[PDB]
Each structure stands twice: as structure tokens, then as C-alpha cells.
Design a protein around this motif. Structure first.
Motif, PDB file in Angstrom:
ATOM      1  N   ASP B  53       0.759  -1.327  -0.055  1.00 20.29           N
ATOM      2  CA  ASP B  53       0.005  -0.239   0.118  1.00 20.29           C
ATOM      3  C   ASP B  53       0.820   1.468  -0.415  1.00 20.29           C
ATOM      4  O   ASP B  53       0.319   2.105  -0.830  1.00 20.29           O
ATOM      5  N   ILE B  54       2.176   1.212   0.953  1.00 25.03           N
ATOM      6  CA  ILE B  54       2.714   1.900   0.857  1.00 25.03           C
ATOM      7  C   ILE B  54       3.638   2.736  -0.347  1.00 25.03           C
ATOM      8  O   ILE B  54       4.033   3.704  -0.958  1.00 25.03           O
ATOM      9  N   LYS B  55       3.743   1.612  -0.941  1.00 23.02           N
ATOM     10  CA  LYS B  55       4.862   1.530  -1.813  1.00 23.02           C
ATOM     11  C   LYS B  55       3.992   2.186  -3.092  1.00 23.02           C
ATOM     12  O   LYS B  55       4.343   3.133  -4.041  1.00 23.02           O
ATOM     13  N   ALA B  56       2.933   1.647  -2.894  1.00 16.28           N
ATOM     14  CA  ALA B  56       1.712   2.077  -4.321  1.00 16.28           C
ATOM     15  C   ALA B  56       1.686   3.940  -4.275  1.00 16.28           C
ATOM     16  O   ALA B  56       1.682   4.136  -5.155  1.00 16.28           O
ATOM     17  N   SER B  57       1.587   4.155  -3.273  1.00 19.55           N
ATOM     18  CA  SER B  57       1.671   4.999  -2.901  1.00 19.55           C
ATOM     19  C   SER B  57       2.970   6.240  -3.792  1.00 19.55           C
ATOM     20  O   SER B  57       2.826   7.219  -3.796  1.00 19.55           O
ATOM     21  N   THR B  58       3.779   5.946  -3.193  1.00 17.73           N
ATOM     22  CA  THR B  58       5.165   6.676  -3.418  1.00 17.73           C
ATOM     23  C   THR B  58       5.741   6.742  -5.343  1.00 17.73           C
ATOM     24  O   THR B  58       5.730   7.627  -5.645  1.00 17.73           O
ATOM     25  N   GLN B  59       4.547   5.695  -6.052  1.00 21.72           N
ATOM     26  CA  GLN B  59       4.786   5.308  -7.219  1.00 21.72           C
ATOM     27  C   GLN B  59       3.605   5.999  -8.029  1.00 21.72           C
ATOM     28  O   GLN B  59       4.926   6.871  -9.445  1.00 21.72           O
ATOM     29  N   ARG B  60       2.890   6.226  -7.307  1.00 23.99           N
ATOM     30  CA  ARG B  60       1.952   7.414  -8.367  1.00 23.99           C
ATOM     31  C   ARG B  60       2.575   8.981  -7.309  1.00 23.99           C
ATOM     32  O   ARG B  60       2.313   9.576  -8.353  1.00 23.99           O
ATOM     33  N   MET B  61       2.973   9.352  -7.407  1.00 29.00           N
ATOM     34  CA  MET B  61       3.756  10.721  -6.488  1.00 29.00           C
ATOM     35  C   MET B  61       5.016  10.907  -6.113  1.00 29.00           C
ATOM     36  O   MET B  61       6.024  10.654  -5.305  1.00 29.00           O
ATOM     37  N   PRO B  62       5.904  10.560  -7.486  1.00 27.86           N
ATOM     38  CA  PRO B  62       6.828  10.557  -7.937  1.00 27.86           C
ATOM     39  C   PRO B  62       7.627  11.522  -6.591  1.00 27.86           C
ATOM     40  O   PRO B  62       7.596  13.147  -6.692  1.00 27.86           O
ATOM     41  N   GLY B  63       8.918  11.401  -6.074  1.00 26.85           N
ATOM     42  CA  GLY B  63       9.522  12.823  -5.498  1.00 26.85           C
ATOM     43  C   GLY B  63       8.969  12.965  -4.257  1.00 26.85           C
ATOM     44  O   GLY B  63       9.492  13.550  -3.763  1.00 26.85           O
ATOM     45  N   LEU B  64       8.171  11.629  -3.753  1.00 26.59           N
ATOM     46  CA  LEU B  64       7.430  12.301  -2.493  1.00 26.59           C
ATOM     47  C   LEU B  64       8.138  12.531  -0.967  1.00 26.59           C
ATOM     48  O   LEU B  64       9.109  11.396  -0.673  1.00 26.59           O
ATOM     49  N   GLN B  65       8.111  13.997  -0.096  1.00 27.67           N
ATOM     50  CA  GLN B  65       9.398  13.562   0.842  1.00 27.67           C
ATOM     51  C   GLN B  65       8.095  13.439   2.270  1.00 27.67           C
ATOM     52  O   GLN B  65       7.627  14.879   1.791  1.00 27.67           O
ATOM     53  N   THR B  66       8.533  12.623   3.074  1.00 26.22           N
ATOM     54  CA  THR B  66       7.645  13.000   4.333  1.00 26.22           C
ATOM     55  C   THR B  66       8.019  13.136   5.223  1.00 26.22           C
ATOM     56  O   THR B  66       8.954  12.313   5.980  1.00 26.22           O
ATOM     57  N   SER B  67       7.652  13.775   6.819  1.00 24.07           N
ATOM     58  CA  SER B  67       8.709  13.748   7.697  1.00 24.07           C
ATOM     59  C   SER B  67       7.346  14.430   9.160  1.00 24.07           C
ATOM     60  O   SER B  67       6.365  14.554   8.625  1.00 24.07           O
ATOM     61  N   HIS B  68       7.556  13.728  10.170  1.00 20.42           N
ATOM     62  CA  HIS B  68       6.679  13.773  11.104  1.00 20.42           C
ATOM     63  C   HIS B  68       7.150  14.739  12.305  1.00 20.42           C
ATOM     64  O   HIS B  68       8.653  14.140  12.591  1.00 20.42           O
ATOM     65  N   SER B  69       6.337  15.176  13.061  1.00 19.33           N
ATOM     66  CA  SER B  69       7.015  15.889  14.116  1.00 19.33           C
ATOM     67  C   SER B  69       5.715  15.461  15.133  1.00 19.33           C
ATOM     68  O   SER B  69       4.988  15.187  15.153  1.00 19.33           O
ATOM     69  N   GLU B  92      10.259  16.235  -4.225  1.00 18.58           N
ATOM     70  CA  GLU B  92      11.513  16.711  -4.780  1.00 18.58           C
ATOM     71  C   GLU B  92      11.492  17.808  -5.748  1.00 18.58           C
ATOM     72  O   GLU B  92      12.580  18.621  -5.891  1.00 18.58           O
ATOM     73  N   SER B  93      10.579  18.355  -6.111  1.00 16.39           N
ATOM     74  CA  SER B  93      10.284  18.951  -7.922  1.00 16.39           C
ATOM     75  C   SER B  93       9.692  19.320  -7.145  1.00 16.39           C
ATOM     76  O   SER B  93       9.946  20.866  -8.694  1.00 16.39           O
ATOM     77  N   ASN B  94       9.580  20.114  -6.067  1.00 15.90           N
ATOM     78  CA  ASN B  94       9.107  21.159  -5.882  1.00 15.90           C
ATOM     79  C   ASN B  94       9.019  22.159  -4.675  1.00 15.90           C
ATOM     80  O   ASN B  94       9.037  21.873  -3.497  1.00 15.90           O
ATOM     81  N   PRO B  95      10.731  21.960  -5.058  1.00 13.98           N
ATOM     82  CA  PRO B  95      11.040  22.941  -3.385  1.00 13.98           C
ATOM     83  C   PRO B  95      10.863  23.647  -3.560  1.00 13.98           C
ATOM     84  O   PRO B  95      10.728  24.298  -3.858  1.00 13.98           O
TER      85      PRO B  95
END
Lengths: 144, 134
Positions: B53-69, B92-95
């Protein structure tokens, strides 16, 4: 354009702080003067500037020190006092474009005082521990 | 091994470090093989289904970076961890474009090995519609 002159509630105050950090963390210097007074007194640790031009120059120099720097801020509790001070507690995040998987995150607080004439920020003091950011690549070449 | 809320928050921080690094082969260090996950309308049973499920999300939105606090965590007498914080995303494509929303995670641990056997993450996904905007 518009700043914080119409702020009378802490909800309005946090919304303004978010607008401010959206401007700052975009590094869109042409927009800084919308929300920051020309006489801004800024403190961030031992670094201190007086005047908007000196503040902009210090931020520009920080992007040279660290090419590819990306920063962002979140907030979870804000108060507006009877003296007009805004206190906003949150988190400060940073990473480098060359290594986006490494994010340094620390708690932070901002203290803001506004100009009564126009609602722009005349005093901004940001407090946070900057030592964890030495983990970013070449923050301190040769170790730390 | 977790008996205090400070130990619980340290564990949650480790879990999100693993997740937000997309370190799929390490997910099993902290997540049960029988993990029941729910994140809004996304819902999976079993670790391998969670990973896919998580791999599917990353393949659908290339360059996704996530972090949590996180800013507050409780550990209850039943052993539940509740942790409130913020979820950040960027491309990554939209700094320069970062979307941040409040979030809460609910975690229950396997009594035999301390791995997460139930993980329920709640947050609004609507603000992330702005991720590709300049």
C-alpha cells in the motif's frame, strides 16, 4: 500589502504567524516587506539584526553558507497578550536538497511585537536549539 | 519494554524515522507481521499488504518526501499509545512547497515482542492537494 493591524484574537494571530513563515521560508525577499517593519529588530540566538535590509542580507548569506537549504515551520499553540505580544510555539525543520532524507527538527518559539501604525512585525525573536542542525551536510566542515 | 510515556514517544519517533525513510525491509523491526493499519480510507491487514500500500503511494507521487513531529504523547493503562503532532510533505520536484497538517497516531503493541500490531493514523489529506503548486 497587508500585515497584522486587524489582529484582535489569538486565532487571527496564529494565522498571521503562518503567513509570515510562509513568506520567510519561501525566501521571496521581495515579499518580506509586506509583513516586516523597515526597522525590524530581529534576534535568533546570538545573531541579531536591526533594519529590514540587514535582516534580508543575513538570510541571503545563510543560503550561501548552505547551498540547497530548505526550511519550514509548524505551530501548535499561540497566544496574543494584552500588551499585544504574540507568542507562538512550534517546530523548525531543515534539510538540504542534496540529501532530502535527512531532516533536522527542533522545537521553537517566536516572540513578535507589531507596529501600532501598520501592523507589521517590528520585533521578532526566534528561540530554538541550533546545535542539532550541525548534523546537516557541511554545516560545520571537518566534524563539529 | 515500554513502561513510560517518554519511552513511548521515543519509540514512536523511531517508527516514523523508519516509515518516513521508506525503509521497507526494516518495517518488520517495529511492525507486526499481522499489522492492522488504517489511515483514513486506506486500510490494510498484514505487513506485506501495508508495504505494498505504501509503495503504491510513492509510485503514484514521484519525489514525495515526508516527515513527522510530535508535541504530546500518552501511554495508557491498557498499553495504547496516543501521539499528537504534525505531518509534513513536499516534493523533490517542487522545492520550497511544504504542506503541514495536524495528525494523531493510535498504536497498540504486541505483548510478545513489542511490535506495533494496530496503527491508526488520522489527518486531513485535503491540504496536500496543494503539493504541486508553485
Amino acid at each position: 500589502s497587508m500585515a497584522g493591524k486587524e489582529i484582535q484574537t489569538p486565532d487571527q494571530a496564529e494565522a498571521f504567524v503562518a503567513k509570515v513563515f510562509d513568506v520567510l521560508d519561501s525566501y521571496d525577499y521581495t515579499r518580506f516587506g509586506e509583513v516586516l517593519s523597515t526597522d525590524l529588530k530581529y534576534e535568533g540566538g546570538l545573531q541579531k539584526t536591526s533594519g529590514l535590509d540587514n535582516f534580508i542580507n543575513d538570510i541571503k548569506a545563510s543560503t550561501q553558507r548552505m547551498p540547497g537549504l530548505q526550511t519550514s515551520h509548524s505551530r501548535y499553540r499561540t497566544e496574543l497578550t494584552a500588551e499585544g505580544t504574540i507568542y507562538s510555539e512550534g517546530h523548525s525543520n531543515a534539510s538540504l536538497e542534496s540529501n532530502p532524507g535527512k531532516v533536522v527538527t527542533v522545537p521553537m518559539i517566536g516572540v513578535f511585537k507589531l507596529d501600532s501604525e501598520d501592523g507589521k512585525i517590528k520585533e521578532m525573536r526566534i528561540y530554538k536549539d541550533r546545535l542539532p542542525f550541525l548534523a546537516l551536510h557541511q554545516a560545520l566542515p571537518g566534524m563539529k
